[PDB]
Design a protein around this nucleic acid. Structure first.
Length: 182
RNA sequence: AGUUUAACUGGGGCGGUUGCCUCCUAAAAUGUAACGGAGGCGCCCAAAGGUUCCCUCAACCUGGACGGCAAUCAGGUGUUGA
């Protein structure tokens, strides 16, 4: 007994508009976002093993779920990197929590970037999966932006059952990502 | 004063070596020598053992903030080259 904003919108308008654009036979062919992905590469694992915990805490406060700590399966010593050194955190988002996260991101933070002209239409890949990146976490009001001791940027990537970049960009437009309309 | 002070060895000496594991020589069973050719061991292990369950890598292509030939991520090819 509840509905998020973007999901109600998705089931109302966007499916209709893509149908009226691309004319699929079955509606099962309709594109739909599955999951959302978050990652943070600490990179100074061999110099600060504590920024890892810092990033864990930030993403906790940001996404409302305890992250995963991705280990280094290979040992490349030109970076000090050794088998099992924690280099980064990672979180998966699916469902109502995902739609809420996109609502927050599109409505609070991305309208808080400094001189946001536009996210490119060219972060796609093969079929329409949008892989962008943030330099700082100085933007989410979710975050306690008084306590941060360093910039700890991140990298986001958005995956969809779309089959090509045209359908991907069209769907993400209907959903309200500020592309550079070109 | 009584006695020891090695062997192999293309004579002896000098050098090197002596035991165990793996490969070729070794001649499609086994086995087979040379001071013939290449290596290694005289350990480690609250788990790197037992059991039940689950999953598949490396590599390449692309996207991608610092990040580059490569770091973590996502998406494909990938019968198996890790």
């Amino acid at each position: 007994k509840a509905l998020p904003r973007l999901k109600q919108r998705y089931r109302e308008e966007i499916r209709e508009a893509l149908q009226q654009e691309f004319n699929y036979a079955n509606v099962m062919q309709i594109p739909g976002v599955v999951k959302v992905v978050v990652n943070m590469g600490v990179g100074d694992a061999a110099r600060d093993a504590k920024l890892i915990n810092g990033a864990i805490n930030d993403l906790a406060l940001i996404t409302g779920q305890k992250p995963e700590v991705r280990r280094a399966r290979k040992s490349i010593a030109q970076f000090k990197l050794r088998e099992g050194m924690p280099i980064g955190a990672r979180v998966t988002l699916r469902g109502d929590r995902m739609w809420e996260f996109l609502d927050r991101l599109i409505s609070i933070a991305l309208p808080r970037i400094r001189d946001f002209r536009g996210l490119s239409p060219k972060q796609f890949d093969g079929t329409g999966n949008y892989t962008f990146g943030l330099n700082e976490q100085s933007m989410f009001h979710e975050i306690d932006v008084d306590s941060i001791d360093r910039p700890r940027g991140m990298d986001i990537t958005v995956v969809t059952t779309a089959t090509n970049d045209a359908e991907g960009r069209a769907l993400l437009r209907a959903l309200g990502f500020p592309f550079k309309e070109n």
